[PDB]
Ligand SMILES: *[C@@H]1O[C@H](CO)[C@@H](O)[C@H](O)[C@H]1NC(C)=O
Protein backbone atom coordinates (compact mmCIF):
# COMPACT_ATOMS: atom_id res chain seq x y z
CA UNK A 1 0.00 0.00 0.00
CA UNK A 2 2.78 2.41 -1.01
CA UNK A 3 0.25 4.94 -2.31
CA UNK A 4 -1.56 5.11 1.04
CA UNK A 5 1.64 5.90 2.95
CA UNK A 6 2.61 8.47 0.30
CA UNK A 7 -0.84 10.07 0.55
CA UNK A 8 -1.15 10.29 4.32
CA UNK A 9 2.43 11.54 4.75
CA UNK A 10 1.92 14.23 2.09
CA UNK A 11 -1.42 15.24 3.60
CA UNK A 12 0.19 15.63 7.04
CA UNK A 13 2.96 17.80 5.58
CA UNK A 14 5.92 17.19 7.91
CA UNK A 15 8.80 14.73 8.18
CA UNK A 16 9.23 15.72 11.84
CA UNK A 17 10.96 12.77 13.52
CA UNK A 18 11.47 12.65 17.28
CA UNK A 19 14.05 10.04 18.24
CA UNK A 20 12.62 7.86 21.00
CA UNK A 21 14.52 5.53 23.33
CA UNK A 22 13.65 1.83 23.45
CA UNK A 23 14.96 -1.14 25.45
CA UNK A 24 16.51 -3.30 22.67
CA UNK A 25 18.29 -5.36 25.32
CA UNK A 26 19.76 -8.60 23.97
CA UNK A 27 20.12 -7.67 20.29
CA UNK A 28 23.00 -5.95 18.52
CA UNK A 29 21.77 -2.68 17.04
CA UNK A 30 22.63 -0.33 14.15
CA UNK A 31 23.40 -3.06 11.63
CA UNK A 32 25.14 -1.37 8.71
CA UNK A 33 24.94 -2.68 5.15
CA UNK A 34 27.09 -2.27 2.06
CA UNK A 35 24.34 -1.04 -0.28
CA UNK A 36 23.52 1.99 1.89
CA UNK A 37 26.58 4.27 1.80
CA UNK A 38 26.84 7.37 4.01
CA UNK A 39 30.13 9.31 4.21
CA UNK A 40 31.85 6.45 2.34
CA UNK A 41 30.86 4.07 5.14
CA UNK A 42 28.53 1.09 5.20
CA UNK A 43 25.22 2.24 6.66
CA UNK A 44 21.45 1.82 6.66
CA UNK A 45 18.17 3.71 6.61
CA UNK A 46 18.41 6.63 9.03
CA UNK A 47 15.05 6.12 10.76
CA UNK A 48 15.35 2.32 11.00
CA UNK A 49 17.47 0.28 13.41
CA UNK A 50 18.64 -3.15 12.26
CA UNK A 51 18.55 -5.77 15.03
CA UNK A 52 21.15 -8.55 14.75
CA UNK B 53 -58.54 61.75 -10.19
CA UNK B 54 -59.28 58.06 -9.66
CA UNK B 55 -57.52 54.72 -9.49
CA UNK B 56 -58.43 51.21 -10.63
CA UNK B 57 -56.58 47.96 -11.32
CA UNK B 58 -56.43 45.63 -14.34
CA UNK B 59 -57.12 42.17 -12.92
CA UNK B 60 -56.38 40.07 -16.02
CA UNK B 61 -52.75 41.09 -16.57
CA UNK B 62 -51.95 40.77 -12.87
CA UNK B 63 -53.26 37.22 -12.72
CA UNK B 64 -51.53 36.22 -15.97
CA UNK B 65 -48.13 37.26 -14.64
CA UNK B 66 -48.88 35.68 -11.26
CA UNK B 67 -49.80 32.41 -13.01
CA UNK B 68 -46.44 32.37 -14.78
CA UNK B 69 -44.68 32.86 -11.43
CA UNK B 70 -46.83 30.11 -9.90
CA UNK B 71 -45.85 27.59 -12.57
CA UNK B 72 -42.17 28.40 -12.07
CA UNK B 73 -42.52 27.98 -8.31
CA UNK B 74 -44.35 24.67 -8.79
CA UNK B 75 -41.54 23.34 -10.95
CA UNK B 76 -38.96 24.20 -8.27
CA UNK B 77 -40.34 23.63 -4.76
CA UNK B 78 -42.41 20.47 -5.28
CA UNK B 79 -39.68 18.08 -6.42
CA UNK B 80 -38.17 15.63 -3.90
CA UNK B 81 -35.04 13.52 -4.45
CA UNK B 82 -35.22 10.15 -2.69
CA UNK B 83 -31.88 8.64 -1.62
CA UNK B 84 -31.44 5.95 1.03
CA UNK B 85 -27.99 4.35 1.39
CA UNK B 86 -24.85 6.26 0.50
CA UNK B 87 -21.14 6.62 1.24
CA UNK B 88 -19.81 8.06 4.50
CA UNK B 89 -18.15 11.48 4.39
CA UNK B 90 -17.18 11.61 8.09
CA UNK B 91 -13.98 9.66 8.75
CA UNK B 92 -12.72 8.85 12.24
CA UNK B 93 -9.17 7.82 11.28
CA UNK B 94 -6.76 8.27 8.36
CA UNK B 95 -7.19 5.47 5.83
CA UNK B 96 -5.26 6.79 2.83
CA UNK B 97 -6.40 5.76 -0.62
CA UNK B 98 -10.09 5.04 -0.22
CA UNK B 99 -10.67 8.16 1.89
CA UNK B 100 -9.28 10.48 -0.79
CA UNK B 101 -11.49 9.04 -3.54
CA UNK B 102 -14.83 9.18 -1.70
CA UNK B 103 -14.09 12.61 -0.23
CA UNK B 104 -13.34 13.84 -3.77
C1 LIG C 1 14.59 -4.18 29.40
O1 LIG C 1 14.35 -5.60 29.45
C2 LIG C 1 14.87 -6.24 30.62
C3 LIG C 1 14.62 -7.73 30.46
O2 LIG C 1 15.06 -8.46 31.60
C4 LIG C 1 14.21 -5.66 31.86
O3 LIG C 1 14.75 -6.29 33.02
C5 LIG C 1 14.43 -4.15 31.91
O4 LIG C 1 13.73 -3.60 33.02
C6 LIG C 1 13.95 -3.50 30.62
N1 LIG C 1 14.23 -2.07 30.63
C7 LIG C 1 13.30 -1.13 30.39
C8 LIG C 1 13.77 0.29 30.45
O5 LIG C 1 12.14 -1.42 30.12
Ligand SMILES: *[C@@H]1O[C@H](CO)[C@@H](O)[C@H](O)[C@H]1NC(C)=O
Nearest residue numbers: 021022024028029030031049
Ligand atom coordinates in the same frame (compact mmCIF):
# COMPACT_ATOMS: atom_id res chain seq x y z
C1 LIG D 1 24.63 2.88 17.08
O1 LIG D 1 25.93 3.66 17.08
C2 LIG D 1 26.11 4.83 17.91
C3 LIG D 1 27.61 4.97 18.06
O2 LIG D 1 28.23 4.77 16.79
C4 LIG D 1 25.42 4.67 19.26
O3 LIG D 1 24.18 5.37 19.28
C5 LIG D 1 25.18 3.19 19.53
O4 LIG D 1 26.39 2.45 19.51
C6 LIG D 1 24.16 2.64 18.53
N1 LIG D 1 22.86 3.26 18.74
C7 LIG D 1 22.06 2.99 19.78
C8 LIG D 1 20.75 3.72 19.80
O5 LIG D 1 22.38 2.20 20.67
